Design a protein around this ligand. Structure first.
Ligand SMILES: N[C@@H](CCC(=O)N[C@@H](CS)C(=O)NCC(=O)O)C(=O)O
Ligand SMILES: N[C@@H](CCC(=O)N[C@@H](CS)C(=O)NCC(=O)O)C(=O)O
Lengths: 293, 291
């Protein structure tokens, strides 16, 4: 089901570019939301766009805030005493009938959802706030014109077979559906492994959003997807050395990627999914969550 | 286990060819012990075997005609539908568990022994009169090594053979962690023992290797994922264990001919209480890496 709040932050538009007006609601466990946290740090937007961390322990009413479901690092809603993320959506639109997903890019002025599509939120962040940033941060652009077509091409099959692929495998309820998802997933990892052989970045020998969008899946792979989602033909760390190297360089050499990566949130969210893991036990491995360089 | 008799000249169960029969599941590591030793000792035409379905049911282990699965067999002797039918033929008032392995006596129609650690010891000597000289000479629990074998078996049994189950069937975070940490500590200890060695004890194959093997061969294919025994894998975390394991599997056909990874994975991942989706993962690929 596609996200249905698809607005932008544009001069003269509904959502004028401003400092201290827009706010992200996210779960650290969610790769889609983590995309927006990574790009928020890359672009130096921490004092321009606020963030609230919901509890990673998904509930019968959806994402709870940290007062409802305490967890280290999870926060109460600062603004409306919202108890679950759905309260934000119903505040924005009492008749809303979509899903109550994170990430939420929220407008505090008009009290509505600007955009709840991670792929668009991170593109908003490329330019919408540049006037509020120092020159070096303003210049960063993870979706530049010259590389857009190439980025779109690799994004298309990474999204379908890898970003969504792990879920297609993990949430499959038949053997047939599981196999139909996990095989194209690992074929695409085989392909990414070739593309990344001898390279630090997927596109253009520079960091782009294609890297960000892949990273949020791959960083969760050995710690959660291999076991919980049965994506276990091989691991990243032992089966895919070019991807493994690319992953570790992003994580260990760029604080935007490590400081937004909370492996305890990640593992707690996935392994609390009772329909898949009814014992609710969280495995202690793999050790470590990500190997050093 | 409560049938604990032996096969001895002059005893209740005389050593004979064609009289005793094993009922086993390929998925069960305890039962696989008896299959491995059966082949090591060349007993295939002396002690029969029937393979039950790995698809454990509400009535226990079914036979292959009840719950078909490649390689699972019908009961040849009593049209048994489930393993419990053998136990109840032996003792209608039996109140124990209907476990495999079963070492069965076709003559008196009873369970001689349903304890794997004793079945494989019976196999060291009880049938030697029926064997060629080279098979007869094999003894996997020899007097000179017994004390050392017993020492390693004690903690392998407690923390590794049983440990994977203590971890996988724990229902609290606390109990899982209490089981999985000693499991991997004991793997660390075994890794040191096996560095530069082909065998755990005495530079020769013993029952200690067999009893460890049945757990380790199931480790990357099932225990890591299904039982959350995932601090590290054998193949990438434990090179000395991995080498020992691969030499046994690839160089001694008793260990490969009796290793059915499809049965192994089907049994574990059909356990609804742990894996309600019932999906069987396609990995790891391969089940065991080559030498
Ligand atoms: N297409 C959205 C997907 C966001 C999404 O699916 N988030 C999940 C968490 S990983 C969520 O909030 N699920 C709650 C639900 O679907 O009810 C995006 O990329 O931002
Ligand atoms: N102590 C016995 C254990 C045998 C055992 O537990 N077998 C399991 C399969 S791995 C079984 O048959 N479980 C059926 C049950 O408990 O009902 C031995 O080592 O032979």
């Amino acid at each position: 089901k596609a996200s249905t709040f698809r607005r932008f932050i544009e001069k003269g538009g509904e959502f004028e570019p401003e400092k201290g007006r827009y706010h992200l609601y996210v779960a650290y466990s969610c790769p889609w939301a983590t995309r927006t946290l990574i790009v928020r740090k890359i672009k130096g937007l921490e004092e321009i766009v606020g963030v609230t961390i919901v509890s990673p322990l998904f509930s019968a009413h959806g994402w709870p805030f940290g007062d409802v479901s305490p967890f280290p690092g999870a926060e109460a809603d600062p603004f409306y005493n919202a108890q679950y993320v759905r309260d934000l959506y119903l505040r924005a639109d009492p008749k809303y009938e979509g899903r109550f997903t994170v990430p939420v890019l929220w407008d505090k002025k008009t009290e509505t959802v600007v955009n709840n599509e991670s792929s668009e939120i991170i593109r908003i962040f490329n330019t919408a706030f540049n006037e509020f940033l120092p020159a070096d941060k303003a210049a960063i652009h993870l979706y530049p014109e010259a590389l857009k077509s190439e980025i779109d091409e690799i994004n298309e099959w990474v999204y379908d077979t890898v970003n969504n692929g792990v879920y297609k495998a993990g949430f499959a309820t038949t053997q047939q559906a599981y196999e139909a998802a996990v095989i194209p997933l690992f074929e695409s990892l085989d392909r990414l492994e070739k593309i990344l052989t001898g390279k630090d970045y997927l596109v253009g020998d520079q960091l782009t959003e294609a890297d960000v969008r892949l990273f949020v899946t791959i960083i969760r792979f050995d710690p959660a997807y291999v076991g919980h989602f049965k994506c276990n033909l091989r691991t990243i760390r032992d089966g895919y050395p070019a991807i493994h190297l690319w992953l570790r360089k992003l994580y260990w050499n760029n604080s935007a990627f490590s400081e937004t990566c909370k492996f305890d949130h990640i593992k707690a969210s996935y392994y609390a999914q009772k329909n898949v893991n009814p014992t609710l036990v969280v495995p202690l491995g793999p050790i470590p969550n990500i190997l050093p360089l």
